[PDB]
Design a protein around this nucleic acid. Structure first.
Length: 50
RNA sequence: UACCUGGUUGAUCCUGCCAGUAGCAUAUGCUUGUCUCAAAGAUUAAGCCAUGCAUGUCUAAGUACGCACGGCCGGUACAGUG
């Protein structure tokens, strides 16, 4: 199930500006970038043994 | 430039120290147009201190839901500045 689906969103309704909603940056979220970093670390191990 | 002048005796020479003389430091006095460098609360009290300042710091790369601002496109977690 998707954690990013269920984020607690915060409204923002101040006069003189457009009413908008903010959401936080989710931490400890698996993304392609952390997986790419993991692959890079294992690659560094590979070249060191070679 | 390895230089001298004077002072004891009625007069001569000498030992001898002193005064003058030149440099360096500090202080001070009088005077003082221009320009270039430039020391400067050590000496006496490592005495005592009013007030202000003398040490802070962010990149693409630790943490951003402060609308403090700010475009989306709209379920697009997080634009970006901060």
């Amino acid at each position: 199930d998707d954690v990013r689906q269920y984020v607690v969103r915060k409204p923002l309704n101040k006069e003189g500006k457009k009413p908008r909603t903010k959401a936080p940056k989710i931490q400890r979220l698996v993304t392609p970038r952390v997986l790419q970093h993991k692959r890079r670390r294992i690659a560094l191990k590979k070249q060191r043994t070679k």
